[PDB]
Amino acid sequence: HHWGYGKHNGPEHWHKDFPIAKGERQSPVDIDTHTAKYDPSLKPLSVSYDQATSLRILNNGHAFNVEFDDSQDKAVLKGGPLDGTYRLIQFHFHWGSLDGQGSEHTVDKKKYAAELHLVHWNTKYGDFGKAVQQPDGLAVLGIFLKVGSAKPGLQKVVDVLDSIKTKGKSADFTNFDPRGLLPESLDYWTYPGSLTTPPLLECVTWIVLKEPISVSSEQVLKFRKLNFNGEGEPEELMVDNWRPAQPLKNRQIKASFK
Ligand SMILES: COC(=O)c1cc(S(N)(=O)=O)c(Cl)cc1S(=O)(=O)c1ccccc1
Numbered sequence: 001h002h003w004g005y006g007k008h009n010g011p012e013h014w015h016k017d018f019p020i021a022k023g024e025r026q027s028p029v030d031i032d033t034h035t036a037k038y039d040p041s042l043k044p045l046s047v048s049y050d051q052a053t054s055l056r057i058l059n060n061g062h063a064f065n066v067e068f069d070d071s072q073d074k075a076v077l078k079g080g081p082l083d084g085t086y087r088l089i090q091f092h093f094h095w096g097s098l099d100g101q102g103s104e105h106t107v108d109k110k111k112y113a114a115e116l117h118l119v120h121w122n123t124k125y126g127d128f129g130k131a132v133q134q135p136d137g138l139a140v141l142g143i144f145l146k147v148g149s150a151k152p153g154l155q156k157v158v159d160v161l162d163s164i165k166t167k168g169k170s171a172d173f174t175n176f177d178p179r180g181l182l183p184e185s186l187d188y189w190t191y192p193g194s195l196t197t198p199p200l201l202e203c204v205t206w207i208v209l210k211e212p213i214s215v216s217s218e219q220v221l222k223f224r225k226l227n228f229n230g231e232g233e234p235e236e237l238m239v240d241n242w243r244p245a246q247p248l249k250n251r252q253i254k255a256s257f258k
């Protein structure tokens with residue numbers, strides 16, 4: 001009886017295996033744009049993805065991960081609110097059963113169709129497993145998706161999904177360039193938070209871009225053909241794999257802009 005996204009094992013249940021679910025810096029949150037304060041001390045974010053090496057794509061039963069080779073200094077995030085270099089290890093998405101839901105963060109209570117998370121770990125901690133044990137171990141760049149015009153740089157991802165339909169399938173996925181997933185503007189909100197999935201560790205500096213990217217209806221429909229079940233089990237479509245907004249508690253959301 002493992003965690004997932006259903007009434008019997010969804011977000012409202014996670015606290016029994018992971019009591020940090022009711023902690024003081026949980027994610028996601030609603031971003032109240034009128035209360036977020038512009039912080040003129042915040043730096044432009046530096047996203048350096050020119051030498052990113054993707055390796056594989058995996059259906060992990062919750063989402064799908066596009067994995068990167070993080071064994072050298074390639075694909076780093078720095079600047080912004082960060083005081084260190086963070087290396088890209090994977091990205092994944094969260095999305096809905098319909099276009100009106102699917103993001104984890106919300107903006108003045110608005111839900112986007114999906115949310116992309118580019119996960120990076122602080123190189124000062126030597127690898128990912130040590131980083132997640134540190135309050136400044138991870139930096140996640142979060143990008144909202146709305147449905148409209150297709151995102152050409154997403155189609156290679158969307159066309160491999162039929163090969164990883166079910167939990168535990170993986171496929172080779174080399175040469176994927178995550179720069180094709182970024183919006184024009186790097187204006188962002190930032191706040192201290194957590195993983196949005198078990199084990200819910202409070203190790204993440206969140207950096208949420210204001211500008212969504214557009215994907216087509218056909219692209220997001222292919223995400224919703226994935227399955228949470230494994231091969232040979234009754235189909236459970238992989239949809240609504242998002243955790244709702246959590247209490248902001250004693251935190252300030254800072255804006256890089258306005
Ligand atoms: C199962 O975990 C995930 O799905 C997940 C999700 C996030 S998210 N959704 O906060 O970006 C991050 Cl940062 C990182 C991860 S994760 O890197 O997959 C992970 C898994 C086990 C322990 C610690 C971290």
Ligand code: NA
Nearest residue numbers: 033034035036
């Ligand atoms: Na404001």
Ligand code: NA
Nearest residue numbers: 069070071072
């Ligand atoms: Na290496």
Ligand code: NA
Nearest residue numbers: 070127128129
């Ligand atoms: Na690692």
Ligand code: NA
Nearest residue numbers: 245246247248
């Ligand atoms: Na709440």
Ligand SMILES: [Zn+2]
Nearest residue numbers: 092094117196
């Ligand atoms: Zn995520």
